[PDB]
Structures are given as structure tokens and as C-alpha cells.
């Protein structure tokens, strides 16, 4: 039964590791995509709600 | 003489059956510890094999 447990949170742990990682991923992305494009386009949200 | 003899063979009866219940007490107490020690090292080798299988 440990042995049991001890394997469910090893996998949570990895999929927490997963999810952190394809975060980072993303967030890395996303910087790349604003470097090249230019954040100027998101100005005209500043009109959303103020 | 009736007398010594009943009084002998209390003290041998009283004698034999310590010496049985002392030696089977030994001989449970020494099987039950080795047993457990078996059950340990058994439970350590399948949590080992339990975590190898898992990484």
C-alpha cells in the first residue's frame, strides 16, 4: 500500500513537473512573440474596462 | 521411605515439566524473531523492486 501511494505521488509530482515546465515553455514563447511583433498591439486593451 | 519417595518424584515431575515449558518458550521465541526478520528483508527487497519499477 505505500508502495502504492509512493507511485500515485510520483505521478502527481511528474505531472506537476509537466505542467510547470510547459509553462515556462509557453511563457518563453509568448516572450518571443512580443519581442518580434511588439507589445504596442495590446495598447488598445487599456480601453477594455478603464 | 514412602515419604522420601513421594517427595522425590514431586520434585522430578515439578523439575521435567520447567525444563519442557522453558525450552518450547526458547524455541517459539527464536522461530517468531527470525520470521520477523525474514518479513522485513522481504518487504525491503519489494519496496526496492516497487521503486525501481516506478522511476
Same mark, same amino acid.
Do not use: F, P, W
Given at each position: *500500500?505505500? *508502495? +502504492?501511494? +509512493? ?5 502527481s509530482?511528474?505531472?506537476? /513537473?509537466? @505542467?510547470? #515546465?510547459?509553462? #515556462?515553455? *509557453?511563457?518563453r514563447?509568448?516572450?518571443? +512573440?512580443? /519581442?518580434?511583433?511588439?507589445?504596442? @498591439? ?6 477594455? @474596462?478603464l | ?12 515431575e ?11 518458550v ?5 522461530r517468531?524473531?527470525?520470521? =520477523? ?15 525501481? =519499477?516506478?522511476?
Open positions: *500500500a505505500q *508502495a +502504492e501511494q +509512493e507511485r500515485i505521488r510520483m505521478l509530482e511528474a505531472k506537476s /513537473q509537466i @505542467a510547470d #515546465l510547459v509553462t #515556462l515553455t *509557453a511563457s514563447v509568448l516572450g518571443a +512573440e512580443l /519581442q518580434a511583433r511588439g507589445h504596442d @498591439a495590446l495598447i488598445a486593451e487599456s480601453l477594455a @474596462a | 521411605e514412602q515419604l522420601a519417595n513421594a517427595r522425590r518424584d514431586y520434585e522430578a515439578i523439575a521435567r515439566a520447567r525444563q519442557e515449558a522453558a525450552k518450547i526458547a524455541q517459539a521465541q527464536e517468531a524473531k527470525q520470521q =520477523e526478520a525474514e518479513i522485513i528483508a522481504q518487504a525491503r527487497r519489494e519496496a526496492e523492486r516497487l521503486k525501481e =519499477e516506478a522511476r
